[PDB]
């Protein structure tokens, strides 16, 4: 696993011969807490009618789970793959000396999951990717990378194409099984897991982070250190840390000087 973690269903045989259509979507782009999940759902152009039903446009946690199992049942034709990204990998990526923002971390993650499908010999002929605002530049980078297929990027994709609507579901469902798994362990180890929504705009989430600042180390793994809310709390609550980027010659070249101090 290491930083990220990929979970995947075996490729249904139909998908290796029949022309396929693929849907890319995510969950967890925005919280301070927990992972960011990416999901691809693919299915034959012929079997699109079967998915037109399991398509919304909202759908509660219970209904999401139900629709997730309904798709998981019909694994004879619907294929899926997930890449669950840790708050730590998100922290480390964005806090490198080399700038590497969420959007880049996000989309590179989309590229890999679409690439996985290709490497699995899924007869992908058309990809649809959901986005947040202005789809253009995203289509440009994505189409340029995948020149053998049509790549469509629309902000309303989770509402236009059932395959994106399905990818939205696995991603949301995986995002909730991952936070429940952390909560379960938290509670086992008698730790406080009452954070709230997970978003930095939540008074209860803000409160939780404030109650959880080790002066030396800051927060536990779960916290996306790279978030401004996260950083801002560490500036007020933890010890100040200065990083690398915030003859008389020999000793100067090694960093050596005499001890007057002692």
């Amino acid at each position: 696993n290491t930083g990220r973690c990929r979970l995947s269903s075996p490729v249904p045989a139909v998908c290796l011969k029949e022309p396929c259509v693929l849907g890319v979507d995510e969950a967890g782009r925005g919280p301070v807490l927990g992972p960011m999940v990416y999901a691809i759902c693919y299915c034959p152009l012929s079997r699109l009618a079967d998915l037109e039903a399991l398509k919304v446009a909202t759908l509660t946690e219970n209904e999401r789970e139900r629709l997730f199992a309904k798709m998981e049942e019909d694994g004879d034709f619907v294929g899926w793959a997930l890449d669950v990204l840790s708050p730590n990998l998100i922290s480390t990526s964005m806090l490198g000396r080399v700038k590497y923002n969420l959007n880049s971390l996000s989309h590179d993650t989309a590229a890999g999951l679409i690439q996985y499908a290709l490497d699995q010999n899924v007869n992908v002929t058309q990809v649809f990717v959901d986005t947040v605002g202005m789809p253009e530049t995203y289509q440009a980078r994505l189409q340029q990378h995948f020149p053998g297929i049509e790549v469509t990027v629309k902000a309303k994709a989770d509402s236009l194409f059932p395959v994106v609507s399905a990818a939205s579901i696995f991603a949301k469902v995986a995002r909730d099984k991952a936070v429940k798994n952390w909560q379960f362990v938290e509670n086992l180890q008698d730790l406080d897991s009452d954070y709230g929504s997970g978003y930095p705009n939540d008074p209860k989430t803000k409160a939780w982070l404030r109650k959880h600042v080790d002066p030396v180390f800051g927060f536990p793994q779960f916290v996306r250190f790279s978030w401004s809310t996260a950083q801002a709390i560490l500036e007020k609550e933890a010890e100040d840390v200065i990083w690398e980027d915030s003859p008389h010659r020999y000793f100067q070249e090694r960093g050596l000087e005499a001890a007057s101090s002692l």
Binding site: I242, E244, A259
Partner: protein, 171 residues
């Protein structure tokens, strides 16, 4: 918590078969510096510090700021004993020179009666440059060494500005 020091001490200091940190005058330039002196085995060591911008230590279950690494490296008392006479030209200072094999070492730069000699010192300092040229070849510090090897002894003596005539022209 209390300030923790990170030392690199010679392997032998450990065994008994007695140890004092004495503030002594810096022979090159400076009012003072730290010197560790062996009283049982009767020897001198200088204290250098590794300080580099933005480092700290995790020492066991604690953090120590700064990231300093202190070194106790054997010192030749000849450099430290030079300042008692050097001013003539023709505090803890006391225990510093008084040791066995002192008089036999003193007959290198100076000479009951002790008299400083400029001739012997230049001959001795020139030998050190070559002695440290051997080390710079073994340790491989990145001919051209002539200027560099002379410079290293300058950080131990103020007579190296008077040995700037000893640079290129030997004396």
């Amino acid at each position: 918590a209390a300030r923790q020091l990170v030392f690199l001490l010679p392997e032998h200091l450990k065994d008994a078969s007695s140890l004092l940190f004495v503030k002594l005058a810096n022979p090159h330039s400076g009012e003072g510096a730290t010197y560790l002196i062996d009283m049982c085995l009767q020897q001198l060591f200088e204290i250098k510090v590794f300080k580099e911008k933005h480092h700290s230590w995790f020492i066991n279950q604690s953090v120590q700021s700064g990231g300093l690494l202190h070194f106790a490296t054997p010192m030749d008392p000849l450099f430290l004993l030079l300042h008692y006479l050097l001013k003539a030209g023709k505090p803890d200072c006391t225990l510093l020179l008084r040791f066995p094999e002192l008089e036999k070492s003193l007959r290198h730069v100076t000479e009951k009666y002790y008299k400083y000699s400029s001739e012997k010192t230049l001959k001795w300092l020139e030998k050190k440059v070559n002695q440290t040229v051997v080390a710079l070849k073994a340790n491989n510090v990145n001919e051209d060494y002539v200027r560099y090897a002379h410079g290293l002894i300058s950080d131990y003596i103020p007579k190296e500005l008077s040995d700037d005539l000893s640079k290129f022209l030997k004396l």
